[PDB]
Amino acid sequence: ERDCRVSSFRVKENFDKARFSGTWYAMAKKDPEGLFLQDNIVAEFSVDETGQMSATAKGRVRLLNNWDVCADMVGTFTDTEDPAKFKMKYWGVASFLQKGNDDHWIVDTDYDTYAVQYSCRLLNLDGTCADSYSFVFSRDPNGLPPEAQKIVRQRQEELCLARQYRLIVHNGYC
């Protein structure tokens, strides 16, 4: 019954880059295919005088055969016609870290408590996502208050992802 076409997904009305700036702690994630950030994930968002949003991110990644490594990433966002939908060019401060360019949607936020992010890297032929990821962020590293949690759960369901998240631990690995 639920519409899981990516083109159907609502995102944050009148998204405000300035209000979104600062530190966001990843509390949960739905993983894409392939190498991804593992845990201890913290993002720092900024916006400059011209209005270009950028970010940095720290987090543990496990390069295969179980090598751990605190990845240190940089992201720059290109605006689209939708104020909450961006193209994110990203890379690591080290050359060998993953680079690429992902859709970056702010699905919902209240700016001072929670944010829900979404990226579809590849569509299915029916308009659903073949390869997605999603972060839930909190301003407080100790987690969301119940009212925000309940909103986030609704957004998770709307993205057709609600069963597919895992919690992210923060234990000082970085």
Ligand X SMILES: CC1=C(/C=C/C(C)=C/C=C/C(C)=C/CO)C(C)(C)CCC1
CA-derived radius of gyration, the chain: 15
Beta carbons of 50 and 72 less than 8 angstroms apart: no
Q: How far is the CB of 102 from ligand X (least distance, A)?
A: 7
Interface with ligand X includes 73 (CB under 6 A)? yes
Interface with Cl ion includes 2 (CB under 5 A)? no
Query: Of 28, 43, 148, 161, which lies in the binding site for ligand X, with binding defined by CB under 6 A?
Result: 43
Nearer to ligand X among residue 78 and residue 150 (C-beta): 78
* Residue 35 contact among ligand X, Cl ion, none, beta carbon within 5 to 8 Å by kind: ligand X
Interface with ligand X includes 57 (CB under 6 A)? yes
- Applying CB under 6 A, which part among 2-10, 32-40, 124-132, 158-166 lies near ligand X? 32-40
Query: Is 98 marked as binding a ligand?
Result: yes
Beta carbons of 74 and 88 less than 8 angstroms apart: no
Hey, how many other C-beta atoms are within 10 angstroms of the C-beta on 39?
Answer: 18
Hey, how many other C-beta atoms are within 10 angstroms of the C-beta on 145?
Answer: 11
Hey, how many other C-beta atoms are within 10 angstroms of the C-beta on 85?
Answer: 19
Binding-site residue numbers for substrate are: 98
